């Protein structure tokens, strides 16, 4: 086969990604016009730390 020039390669990439992507995104992203877990961890550590420090270690 002859897929060597960047134009045919670009067209192939765009069409193959657009048509054969089950999930929505590809057609939305490849429009040809232009051609929290840390908060949960912080909450857990905050609540734990208040209970945690109640004693003195020598």
């Amino acid at each position: 086969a002859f897929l060597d020039n960047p134009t045919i390669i670009l067209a192939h990439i765009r069409q193959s990604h657009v048509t054969s992507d089950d999930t929505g995104m590809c057609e939305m992203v490849l429009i040809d016009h232009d051609v929290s877990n840390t908060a949960q961890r912080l909450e857990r550590l905050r609540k734990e730390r208040q209970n945690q420090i109640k004693c003195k270690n020598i």
Binding site: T19, V35, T38, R41
Partner: protein, 1117 residues
């Protein structure tokens, strides 16, 4: 919100960006996004220019980059969208990159904070950035995209493919920034977990494109990057992902096998992959053959599927006996397309009957011969023999069939020197003849040889007509060809004995008769009811007649797929022909039978008011074979007279008009005989001119069945029918007729018949012009087109425009053939018609071509190639194809050897840097070898060619098919090596000193440039940074060393907990933007995993950055 669109643009946009900056107080997000939409509309309707806008670009950028820090996803998406509409030149992008806004975009990409609309605008913006200027792409967004595509499948991210597509689009215009941050590795490791064929091939094509040109070939390692795709096969215990679910371990293995197969059979379709996998060193093709010779019944059974679909061969069924898998690869096996509803006879004739072209190049054969030679050079036959002997039966049968197919392909597409010592099979014959080895190996080798001979017999048998209409068609054609150019008596005794043992007269119970004896009593030479006047014979005939009549409802009711259904139809055909054999005594029966058939046909067609719909019985019972009886009755001259005595032809003429039943037209168009002129051609012409569009299409497609079957006098009426079909209102019918004409024009007797009736082939597409160009190939027609000023009008047209469009045409054909591109089993890639090839044929247009001085410029272009841009490579390809079409005959080698250009092409086919033209040169050198003088010229330069044509299957070793191959296939696989482009204090104090005890600037790589805020102080007159509340210089370098240690991914939990405790204890250390700038510059230059990167970016989320917003609002007004 509140748009006016009628005011001073400066004051309006100033109010807009002031409300945008919002001073971080008293402004809601909804009104801010409304103002952002207003600014987008203002930028749309009013052109962007620093004069008509009233403000410089820097102010717009500094007021727009603050919407990316907004907490609302809608405002962030609106800011990204409004920033995309601003980037329209290289200067705007350069200024957007001077301020470190790429940090904010890379941040907006990798949050996955329940926002699949805000992350789409970011990718659209980076695509616009790549489009505007790809030589300035920042490394931050590059690293972000690489991290998303590298570890996005495990985190269930839904933007994986959308990021890999952008990475591949970026690697075409800026490969250094993608190879530096390790993007090519992401691409290559993303093809082994991609089951989708089109995406897998679009991913492998960019890697195979970087290896094509040298300037990009410097960005790929030697034997470790491309050869990764065949690691699942070469590595018996292959682990792709380091951390995967232990529940799925076999499904993962099958997915890896499927993806690796789809990538391996996709690198062998490109020249940059063929050359790079078959290099003369320790290549990746020898590692694929070597692991085939290891008794591992899991890898060995999976490599055979790749070998089968590499050579485009059909797979046999999974069995243990050779005689059952040999039957499944029969070229004539039934297919679903051959059913009456789908493709009744026209699709069946295409498969079994051969093409009319016996000298066309058929580039597919060239490609397959090159691949087969490259595989034989590295020892594939020895590996196949070792698989045949020392393996299981399930794999032995499949390897024996593959070896048989390869051995048959060898003596068909390979030059004699390449295939005159392959049929010896020394390693198998020495094993089958050695009585020292164990007897099991000897016996299985002998069995393999026997199976190979059986396969060869099957191959030299040929495909046979599966159906009963095509069988009669071919038999009638053969009989006509035989009779155009030039047994026992059984008087009274044996006849009566055979009539007695048949059991027809003993009892009238059907399905219990001896049908073999009936067939032989009907087919015996001199038994014709005209010389043997016996009452028992008349009883026999009357009983068979009453059985075969449809009104009796005896034969017309048996369903298809019956135990003995073909035999009953054959016996009926020879019976209605035996009745015709008695022209004076067989009227009372034949007339009755045909009249009953006409009654049934008029009742089932809809010529009655009872039901007018009987398709439920014709389609599922043997009553549809009553068209075969009329078919075998219309061949004989005395048959058509009897057929016209009854209203048969009028019945078909009336049936041609209806619109509800399309199967009846298929049945009547594939049953009648059109050998002689009469009422049989009128029905065909009526169906071809005035009928249903689908029926008309099938009728015009049923002309290959009359062409490939070599029906006599086809050039008289078939050519005229195709010419009148070219004027059809429907477009698909016209294109099909054009294709049939292009195939029929391969015979000179047919091209002379087409020229004698000058058609109008100019008002059609490119196919019509390519068909009309064939007229020049012969003087009678070339001299005709030359008078009306058509050759000189086409010469300059092909010189300026269509020489570079022919290469696009042939590349499109090759791609549609074997790359699964589909521009908006093995096919036949026949070479398109080239004007230069037609002008050289008759020595009169040859001089007309030589006086134009066209060979000199083409020779000069081939001798002085640019090989730097992609337009000059296109021009070199066009020149090579033109020179190869010129040297397709003996009058072209004369004016082609005066310049001595063939050595230049032969040297370009083995020393060029670009590999696509190195394959184009192979195709052109093959095309050169269509004549004896061409092969003689090529032999002096050590290039063999096939000296036989496509006329005979087994030609005796002493116009041709164009195929040329080097004597040593490793000559064109030499690539010049290009070196890789890479070869061209507190951290120790923290080890022994803790944090609480040390409590009783810190930015290493921080300058005025590369800081989000500090860049503005000189350009936009920002007020200098305030002094923070040595108590804070320590925590700064502490969080810096923590985020540095978080990069090794060795112990991420400890550093994450440390960062969390630092955020909990001092929530103000994550407020200085001069630290966020540093950590973002660190993210833009290191390899962080996706979860760690998301955590780091989320640490700085609930921050205010009040001073920058205040200074932006101050410098604004």
């Amino acid at each position: 919100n509140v748009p006016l669109d009628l005011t001073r643009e400066p004051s309006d946009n100033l109010r807009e960006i002031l409300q945008n900056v919002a001073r971080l107080q008293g402004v809601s997000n909804m009104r801010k996004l409304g103002h952002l939409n207003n600014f987008t509309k203002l930028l749309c309707d009013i052109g962007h220019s620093e004069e008509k806008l009233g403000f410089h670009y820097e102010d717009i950028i500094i007021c727009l980059r603050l919407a990316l820090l907004n907490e609302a996803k809608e405002v962030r998406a609106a800011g990204l969208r409004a920033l995309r509409y601003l980037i329209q030149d290289s200067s705007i992008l350069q200024k957007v990159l001077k301020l470190k806004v790429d940090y904010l975009i890379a941040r907006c990409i990798d949050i996955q904070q329940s926002n699949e609309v805000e992350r789409t605008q970011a990718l659209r913006l980076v695509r616009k950035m790549i489009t505007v200027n790809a030589s300035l792409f920042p490394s931050s967004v590059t690293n972000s995209l690489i991290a998303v595509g590298n570890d996005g499948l495990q985190e269930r991210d839904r933007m994986v493919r959308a990021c890999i597509a952008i990475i591949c689009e970026l690697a075409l215009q800026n490969p250094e920034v993608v190879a530096l941050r390790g993007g090519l590795n992401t691409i290559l490791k993303n093809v082994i977990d991609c089951q989708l064929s089109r995406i897998n091939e679009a991913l492998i094509t960019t890697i195979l494109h970087l290896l094509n040109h040298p300037k990009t070939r410097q960005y790929v390692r030697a034997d470790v990057e491309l050869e990764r795709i065949l690691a699942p096969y070469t590595d018996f215990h292959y682990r792709h992902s380091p951390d995967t679910a232990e529940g799925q371990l076999k499904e993962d293995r099958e997915a890896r096998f499927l993806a690796s197969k789809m990538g391996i059979i996709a690198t062998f379709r490109s020249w940059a992959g063929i050359i790079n996998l078959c290099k003369p060193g320790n290549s990746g093709i020898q590692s694929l053959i070597g692991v085939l010779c290891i008794p591992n019944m899991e890898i060995r059974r999976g490599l055979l599927e790749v070998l089968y679909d590499i050579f485009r061969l059909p797979l046999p069924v999974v069995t243990e006996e050779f005689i059952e898998a040999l039957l499944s690869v029969d070229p004539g096996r039934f297919q679903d397309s051959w059913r009456l509803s789908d493709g009744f006879v026209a699709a069946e004739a295409k498969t079994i009957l051969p093409h009319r072209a016996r000298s066309r190049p058929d580039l597919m054969d060239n490609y397959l011969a090159l691949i087969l030679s490259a595989f034989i050079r590295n020892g594939l036959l020895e590996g196949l023999v070792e698989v045949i002997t020392n393996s299981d039966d399930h794999i032995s049968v499949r390897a024996t069939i593959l070896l048989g197919e390869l051995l048959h392909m060898a003596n068909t597409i390979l030059p004699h020197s390449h295939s005159h010592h392959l049929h010896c099979l020394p390693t198998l014959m020495n094993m089958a003849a050695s009585f020292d080895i164990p007897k099991e190996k000897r016996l299985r080798a002998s069995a393999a040889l026997n199976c190979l001979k059986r396969f060869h017999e099957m191959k030299k048998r040929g495909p046979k007509p599966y159906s009963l209409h095509l069988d009669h068609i071919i038999q009638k054609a053969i009989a006509t060809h035989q009779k155009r150019d030039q047994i026992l008596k059984d008087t009274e005794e044996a006849l009566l004995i055979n009539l007695r043992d048949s059991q027809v007269l003993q009892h009238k119970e059907n399905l219990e008769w001896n049908w073999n004896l009936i067939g032989t009593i009907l087919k015996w030479p001199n038994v014709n009811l005209r010389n043997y006047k016996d009452e028992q014979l008349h009883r026999f005939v009357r009983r068979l007649l009453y059985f075969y009549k449809p009104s009796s409802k005896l034969y017309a009711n048996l369903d298809l797929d019956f135990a003995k259904a073909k035999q009953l139809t054959v016996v009926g055909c020879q019976f209605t022909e035996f009745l015709l054999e008695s022209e004076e005594d067989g009227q009372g029966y034949l007339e009755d039978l045909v009249k009953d058939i006409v009654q049934w046909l008029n009742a089932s067609s809809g010529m009655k008011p009872e039901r007018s719909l009987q398709n439920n019985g014709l389609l599922t019972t043997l009553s549809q074979h009553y068209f075969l009886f009329i078919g075998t009755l219309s061949c004989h001259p005395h048959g058509v007279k009897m057929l016209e005595k009854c209203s048969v032809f009028q019945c078909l003429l009336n049936l041609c008009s209806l619109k509800n039943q399309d199967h009846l037209l298929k049945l009547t168009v594939s049953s009648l005989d059109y050998s002689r002129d009469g009422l049989a051609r009128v029905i065909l012409s009526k169906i071809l001119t005035a009928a249903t569009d689908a029926c008309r299409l099938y009728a015009t497609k049923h002309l290959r069945v009359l062409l490939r079957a070599n029906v006599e006098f086809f050039n008289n009426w078939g050519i005229e029918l195709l010419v009148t079909q070219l004027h059809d209102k429907n477009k698909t019918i016209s294109s099909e007729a054009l294709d049939i004409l292009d195939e029929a024009c391969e015979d000179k007797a047919n091209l002379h018949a087409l020229i004698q009736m000058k058609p109008a082939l100019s008002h059609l597409g490119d196919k019509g012009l390519l068909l009309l160009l064939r007229f020049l190939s012969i003087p009678k027609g070339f001299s005709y087109l030359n008078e009306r000023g058509y050759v000189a009008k086409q010469l300059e047209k092909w010189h300026r425009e269509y020489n570079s469009k022919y290469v696009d045409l042939i590349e499109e054909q090759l791609n549609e053939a074997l790359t699964t591109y589909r521009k908006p089993q093995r096919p036949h890639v026949y070479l398109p018609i080239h004007l230069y090839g037609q002008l050289v044929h008759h020595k009169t247009g040859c001089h007309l071509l030589e006086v134009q001085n066209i060979i000199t410029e083409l020779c000069r272009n081939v001798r002085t190639p640019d090989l730097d841009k992609w337009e000059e490579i296109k021009k070199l390809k066009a020149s090579l194809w033109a020179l190869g079409n010129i040297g397709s005959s003996n009058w072209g080698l004369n004016l082609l050897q005066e310049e001595n250009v063939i050595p230049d092409i032969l040297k370009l086919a083995k020393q060029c840097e670009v590999l696509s033209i190195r394959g184009t040169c192979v195709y052109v050198l093959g095309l050169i070898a269509k004549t004896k003088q061409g092969c003689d010229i090529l032999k002096c330069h050590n290039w063999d060619a096939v000296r036989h044509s496509r006329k005979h299957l087994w030609p005796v070793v002493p116009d041709y098919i164009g195929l040329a191959l080097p004597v040593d296939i490793n000559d064109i696989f030499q690539v010049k090596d290009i070196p890789y482009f890479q070869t061209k204090s507190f951290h120790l104090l923290r080890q022994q000193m803790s944090l609480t005890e040390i409590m009783n600037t810190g930015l290493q790589e921080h300058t005025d440039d590369n800081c989000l805020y500090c860049v503005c102080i000189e350009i936009l007159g920002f007020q200098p940074s305030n002094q923070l509340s040595m108590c804070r210089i320590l925590l700064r370098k502490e969080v810096l060393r923590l985020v540095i240690n978080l990069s090794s991914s060795v112990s991420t939990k400890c550093h994450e907990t440390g960062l969390l405790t630092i955020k909990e204890k001092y929530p103000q250390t994550f407020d200085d933007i001069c630290l966020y700038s540093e950590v973002s510059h660190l993210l833009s230059h290191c390899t962080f995993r996706l979860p760690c990167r998301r955590f780091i970016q989320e640490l700085f989320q609930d921050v205010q950055f009040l001073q920058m917003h205040e200074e932006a609002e101050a410098v604004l007004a």
